[PDB]
Design a protein around this ligand. Sequence first.
Ligand SMILES: C/C=C/C=C/CCC[C@H](C)C(=O)c1c(O)c(-c2ccccc2)c[nH]c1=O
Ligand SMILES: C/C=C/C=C/CCC[C@H](C)C(=O)c1c(O)c(-c2ccccc2)c[nH]c1=O
Ligand SMILES: C/C=C/C=C/CCC[C@H](C)C(=O)c1c(O)c(-c2ccccc2)c[nH]c1=O
Ligand SMILES: C/C=C/C=C/CCC[C@H](C)C(=O)c1c(O)c(-c2ccccc2)c[nH]c1=O
Ligand SMILES: Nc1ncnc2c1ncn2[C@@H]1O[C@H](CSCC[C@H](N)C(=O)O)[C@@H](O)[C@H]1O
Ligand SMILES: Nc1ncnc2c1ncn2[C@@H]1O[C@H](CSCC[C@H](N)C(=O)O)[C@@H](O)[C@H]1O
Ligand SMILES: Nc1ncnc2c1ncn2[C@@H]1O[C@H](CSCC[C@H](N)C(=O)O)[C@@H](O)[C@H]1O
Ligand SMILES: Nc1ncnc2c1ncn2[C@@H]1O[C@H](CSCC[C@H](N)C(=O)O)[C@@H](O)[C@H]1O
Ligand SMILES: [Cl-]
Ligand SMILES: [Cl-]
Ligand SMILES: [Cl-]
Ligand SMILES: [Cl-]
Ligand SMILES: [Cl-]
Ligand SMILES: [Cl-]
Ligand SMILES: [Cl-]
Ligand SMILES: [Cl-]
Lengths: 389, 389, 389, 389
Amino acid sequence: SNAETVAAIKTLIQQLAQSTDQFGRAEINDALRELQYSLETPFDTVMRMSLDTAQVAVARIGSDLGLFKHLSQCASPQSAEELADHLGCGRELMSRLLRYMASVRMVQQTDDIKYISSNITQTLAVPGLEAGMRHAFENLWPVLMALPDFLAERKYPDIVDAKDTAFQKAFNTDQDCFHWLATQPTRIANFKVLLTDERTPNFLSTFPLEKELGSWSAEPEKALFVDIGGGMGHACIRLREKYPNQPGRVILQDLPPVLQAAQATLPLSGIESMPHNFHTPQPVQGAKFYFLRLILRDFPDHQALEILQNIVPAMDAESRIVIDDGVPPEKGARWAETGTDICIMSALGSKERTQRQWEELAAKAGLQLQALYQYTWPVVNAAMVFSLQ
Amino acid sequence: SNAETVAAIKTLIQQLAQSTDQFGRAEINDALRELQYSLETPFDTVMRMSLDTAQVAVARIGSDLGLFKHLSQCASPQSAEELADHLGCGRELMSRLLRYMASVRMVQQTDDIKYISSNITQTLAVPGLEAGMRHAFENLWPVLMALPDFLAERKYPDIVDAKDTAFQKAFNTDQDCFHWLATQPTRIANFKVLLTDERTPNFLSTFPLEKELGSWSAEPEKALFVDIGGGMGHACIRLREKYPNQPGRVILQDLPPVLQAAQATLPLSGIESMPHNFHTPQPVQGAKFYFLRLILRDFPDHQALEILQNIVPAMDAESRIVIDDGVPPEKGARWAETGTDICIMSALGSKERTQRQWEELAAKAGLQLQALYQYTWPVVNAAMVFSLQ
Amino acid sequence: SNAETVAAIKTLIQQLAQSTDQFGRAEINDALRELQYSLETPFDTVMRMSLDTAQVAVARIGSDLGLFKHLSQCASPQSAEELADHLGCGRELMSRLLRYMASVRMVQQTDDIKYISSNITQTLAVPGLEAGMRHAFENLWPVLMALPDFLAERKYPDIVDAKDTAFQKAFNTDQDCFHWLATQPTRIANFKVLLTDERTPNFLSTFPLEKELGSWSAEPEKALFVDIGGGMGHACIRLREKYPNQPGRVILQDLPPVLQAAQATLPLSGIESMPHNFHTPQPVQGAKFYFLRLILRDFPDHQALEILQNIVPAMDAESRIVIDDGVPPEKGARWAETGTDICIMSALGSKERTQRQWEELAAKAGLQLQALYQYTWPVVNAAMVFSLQ
Amino acid sequence: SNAETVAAIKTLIQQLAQSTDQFGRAEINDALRELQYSLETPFDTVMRMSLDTAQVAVARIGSDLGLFKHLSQCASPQSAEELADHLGCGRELMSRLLRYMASVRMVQQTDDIKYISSNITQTLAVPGLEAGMRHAFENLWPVLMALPDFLAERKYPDIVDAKDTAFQKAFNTDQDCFHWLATQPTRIANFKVLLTDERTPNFLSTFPLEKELGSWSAEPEKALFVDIGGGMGHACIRLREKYPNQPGRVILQDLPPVLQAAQATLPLSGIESMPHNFHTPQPVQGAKFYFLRLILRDFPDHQALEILQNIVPAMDAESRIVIDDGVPPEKGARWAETGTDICIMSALGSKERTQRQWEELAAKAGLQLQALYQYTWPVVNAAMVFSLQ
Ligand SMILES: C/C=C/C=C/CCC[C@H](C)C(=O)c1c(O)c(-c2ccccc2)c[nH]c1=O
Ligand SMILES: C/C=C/C=C/CCC[C@H](C)C(=O)c1c(O)c(-c2ccccc2)c[nH]c1=O
Ligand SMILES: C/C=C/C=C/CCC[C@H](C)C(=O)c1c(O)c(-c2ccccc2)c[nH]c1=O
Ligand SMILES: C/C=C/C=C/CCC[C@H](C)C(=O)c1c(O)c(-c2ccccc2)c[nH]c1=O
Ligand SMILES: Nc1ncnc2c1ncn2[C@@H]1O[C@H](CSCC[C@H](N)C(=O)O)[C@@H](O)[C@H]1O
Ligand SMILES: Nc1ncnc2c1ncn2[C@@H]1O[C@H](CSCC[C@H](N)C(=O)O)[C@@H](O)[C@H]1O
Ligand SMILES: Nc1ncnc2c1ncn2[C@@H]1O[C@H](CSCC[C@H](N)C(=O)O)[C@@H](O)[C@H]1O
Ligand SMILES: Nc1ncnc2c1ncn2[C@@H]1O[C@H](CSCC[C@H](N)C(=O)O)[C@@H](O)[C@H]1O
Ligand SMILES: [Cl-]
Ligand SMILES: [Cl-]
Ligand SMILES: [Cl-]
Ligand SMILES: [Cl-]
Ligand SMILES: [Cl-]
Ligand SMILES: [Cl-]
Ligand SMILES: [Cl-]
Ligand SMILES: [Cl-]
């Protein structure tokens, strides 16, 4: 029975996935993807490429309607008619959307053709994760749609500049992405929500802080941790939580509107909010750790170098710059890393960097790599610790 | 070992897949997709939705460069430098594109970071399949990108009309999709290549021709088979190949430029080419089978009914209309059926139809279902045989 | 590749087995046995039955030579020549024995044809487990070899009497098994070593001692626990270890030579050693628990009933008899339970008993079942708690 | 759910086993055995060794009762009571035997505690396979039971002589096994039935007969195939069946009582029956193939050599001796090969021989190996083709 074999495959893979940790499950997931691509027919390859696109548009519709939040609060299965009337959607349209969503697990369909939430329903109901999906639709899609004709018209140049990539064609502007976004309040509002998502795990799961501290003294009143472009301060909060007895100033640096958003959820004491533009010289002198998490991947080499050169004059011999970012391998990189590389090339002119490419960038700022502490697998995020040469 | 477990999963799934037939492999692939969606983390759900989009854009770039056709005929692994110089691409751009393609199996990357064809490379090198991918990029993507805001601004109506759906917003026109496309030479040229793809299996694998004929007789120059909108005539060719001694005319009906393109590959005798617009009265009277394959799914009910009403006056008591099309189930429909439904809703105002919906449509034309012969699974395509009521 | 498929099966089963507990692994092992029996060819069925017998004979030879104890303490692989010379075995004989042992995992053979311990080597080096294997060879095998012709010559009677079963034919005696064994010094010495094996888990993992005690009070030098035929006293030791502050005497009852052997490993206080023959009236009056673990399965109903009838006059209203023994199900019993049933039928005239059969036996002694506490699965051992009717 | 996981393991292994051929299934079976042995607890190891022995005794009882033949003819499930009354067995004994048999798949137990035949029931109902089981019980078991004390009393000698092994102790005789068996009519009768079993596959599945023939001429009246000790002539029958047009005499040689048994099932023409004792000079001169299947493994080197030396003088330059027998590997031999080695050592003083050991034996007869044609895996049986040196 082919149905019996499929059911047994599902049982065994679900059991193997429970038998391991999140990194093992991520490896299983990538294997399932590779198996699919290798087992599909040629026609199914093109069908998959033609249709998987629709998931983002339909998630965006469900988000607009409030469907995922509503369904995640429902105590019993709901009919399409009930959902349509409650959310203000045409009954036929709602039925067709829900049938599509159930087929890609965006919701679950029951045996009597009613609907309940799935894991994906709950995910899309979370404001920060919903904002990530809406970002993909409104900011990533236009840039990817413009990229092939941009490259064709320009005879396939290497993209190296934030002011000369697919973004300018997609949005009919000469500004770079970050400058243009600052003029679009609806997009700024979505980014504000996006900043509330906290990635897990984080670098403190593997970072040997006491080892890296050595004999560094916080006395008289030195800074332990300067979180440069720290957003909502999640790194600062987790640091104080994990190391509540380590002395030294912990400083969140970001732009004033972001620091105001962060205030509601920062601890009452122990974390300073310091307005600071990281394109200017670093004001905090002689801190133990200057921390840059997912900052430098958004910038081409010239601008990333300037950010580092703004920090180096503040360092003393014991200071370290900690770059927490993606470190793809030299070969066999996975779709999350290479896909991110193509997207930030097209929107920002930047790139993902291997360890050798990080070291080459840091060397231009007078820095040398002392240690690298991986904390995710198989897609590598790592805290890279640099000192003065 | 995580690597050892992952390799063992791949080995066992591959062995199970090779032991079943194409329909069993399709069921396995659908299960792998379901497992992937159920095992991903919330962040990975959003990352998947954010990035899987890039596959179509990068395939379009590879098609523009001629990369897949070139790699499919190479007899040894090629470096990114060699490919860039041969195809006229910037070397860094080519390297980043190839790394992305390898991570989604669009090519294969070797242990010394060179590149060879994968199954997907060969697929994208086939002109008809390449054309399907280009169609997804240039025709489906803009309509899907317009659908969420189209529905929002119109307060979520049921889409019922080809002249009032997302297409009009996407391409800034009041024309319906088919009328507009016929004004766009480059898009027409891609559709001509798309028609060269022949789907397998086909309805003749399960259609009981002898039983359906009964004592039918061709005595007065009558037609056995009229292929309405038959494209390149694949159904006529396969019919003559499988039943070479069955009497009766076999007639391919389409518009003149498609019949012209079909001539090169049609047999030199046995199949007549007859220009005919299926929005006009059917000229062939009393044929045994009037055959409509993947025609009516492109039209809303009102227009699909008019196509049928142009045939019914030509029928005698022995005539049958054979609708060969998708028959999604009442529940548990799969992503290929529901995804198609949402795309053709957005571009064409049409829909996929359950068996009951096909019967309701045909009844408005005065037709009754006599037999239904499935020939694919689990996504069902079937030849539905209708007679006069 | 057959080798690759086989390796992948092993990897996946190993991973599934390590992800469950000991009871889950027992269920997996029973499924592997069932699969093996269902997938063997008819010839392989007979070959398996013909040859699996040799494992006991070869283990006995390895035990006689001291091979498993020696190999378990070796720090490097040993050649067959080295083992033969050390153990005093002909070199060709030793080589052929070791090749056989490696093929059934009794040792492991290395890639350069030397030998190291396997899990089974270590098992057969443990004195109590080695003694169980020697018992199978010298006591169980002769009775099983005599059973078919014993039943044939007697026209297939129900075996009901310890003095009239296959044992008498196998050892050419009119004595029952236990009486005869007590005349055979070498066999007695092996049983003494066998008693040093402690089964895990034990009944204290699920026995709700506090609930079963209720308001029981030890005030007049009363006994909490009387271990009847307790052997080395493992149940008394575990009880004192788990409930060190519970008042009440804890008493180990057995025959003098077994109590003597127990002294070396008993705690120096807290457990009394009391010589007592359980075929005679119980001397300890009004104890809370009279405990019989794996005693009554060795006796037919008439003798098991007499053992219980020697205890019941010592009971007061609060006393309980706790029978800790196998409780096979009414259907679907597993090979360990039914195999034991056939062996003890042939040697001892006794039987395994379902819960209903235990209740019927105990009712003849005027006892009623109050509670049953399983502590192993899927082959069930349980502590059955009986009170006066 | 652990029950769900076990069910899925069974489904997937059953599907993998159907996806391959008999050799692949044999490899899977050996892997299942290895997994069991590696996953059992120490206690379960000794329990398995103690109890698996009982299968042979219980199969022997079922054979005595006619149970397997009766159940294999039953059209519906049978109760233990019905089976007991029909076969003349005590009702309790029958119930306990059937429960044991169901737990080792010797029969199947239904949900309402009735019994139906399994694959093993059908196997044990086949006369030749039943005879193999009865041989294991009455001839192999006594020799294995005597082997440990035989070796101990003799200080572990290398066994080299058919008149000085465990057989003489087991059966209290000074005769060798084959000479003693000739005086025991009940054992001779079982061997007669055993000879009717035909092993599959056979050497003709891979033997390149036309290649090995070369230009050999059967003219004037030469012998193609001389089946030395050919038993019922299965090799001769299959040869004539597969190669019906190859000329040349095909001659079955065996002892007169065996040739008389063979007559009923030999073809009416084309195969000669020739009484011949293979301890005397071969009478047929200059045959192309002198065939010895599973003959020489029953003899120590001295006697096996004499059998070959009786053939060599009959050979001309084109003659070949074909030894069809087991060829275990130099390392990693499997339980069927090593177990057979231990059994024939104990009963016959002989041995299984590697390819090098076959070549060394044949070289003493003036023979050289020309080709080796395997036809079973993973346990190797092969047709080894030898010519004059
Ligand atoms: C080699 C081809 C592989 C294709 C795989 C799946 C294609 C999915 C895709 C939504 C599909 O099915 C259909 C269309 O796009 C269209 C259309 C025709 C013109 C403009 C827009 C859409 C009509 N009618 C369809 O059905
Ligand atoms: C909850 C969020 C989930 C997201 C998962 C995958 C996100 C993939 C995505 C290409 C990504 O990584 C990045 C960006 O889009 C951008 C950006 C910022 C502004 C405009 C366009 C792109 C910058 N820098 C990035 O790195
Ligand atoms: C239908 C039969 C199935 C048997 C499967 C396995 C048989 C294993 C078994 C040790 C075997 O192989 C051999 C013998 O017992 C004997 C023998 C002959 C006479 C007396 C004792 C042993 C000779 N020579 C053998 O080779
Ligand atoms: C370390 C030990 C491992 C043992 C695993 C399974 C042993 C199976 C085995 C049939 C078993 O259970 C029993 C006996 O042999 C006996 C006995 C006692 C004296 C003589 C003969 C049999 C009594 N009562 C039993 O129950
Ligand atoms: N010029 C600038 N100076 C300081 N912060 C900036 C900046 N431009 C952008 N940023 C901030 O950089 C952050 C990038 S995203 C937040 C990443 C953060 N380090 C984390 O991992 O949680 C945003 O908070 C944004 O407000
Ligand atoms: N008005 C019209 N009259 C006749 N054919 C038409 C038409 N409009 C579109 N078509 C044809 O309808 C076909 C739709 S796709 C081809 C489907 C074909 N029946 C097959 O399965 O092989 C195209 O060949 C197109 O040329
Ligand atoms: N007549 C008798 N009186 C008391 N003990 C006896 C006896 N006959 C046998 N025994 C003891 O009964 C025990 C059987 S085996 C030991 C079982 C023990 N209850 C346990 O599970 O740990 C042996 O210790 C043996 O010495
Ligand atoms: N001295 C002897 N001369 C000829 N045949 C003998 C013999 N001693 C035993 N045999 C025969 O050798 C055979 C061994 S078993 C049969 C094996 C046979 N070659 C086959 O594969 O089918 C028996 O038929 C037995 O009768
Ligand atoms: Cl701390
Ligand atoms: Cl890579
Ligand atoms: Cl198809
Ligand atoms: Cl058919
Ligand atoms: Cl146990
Ligand atoms: Cl408890
Ligand atoms: Cl032939
Ligand atoms: Cl070996």
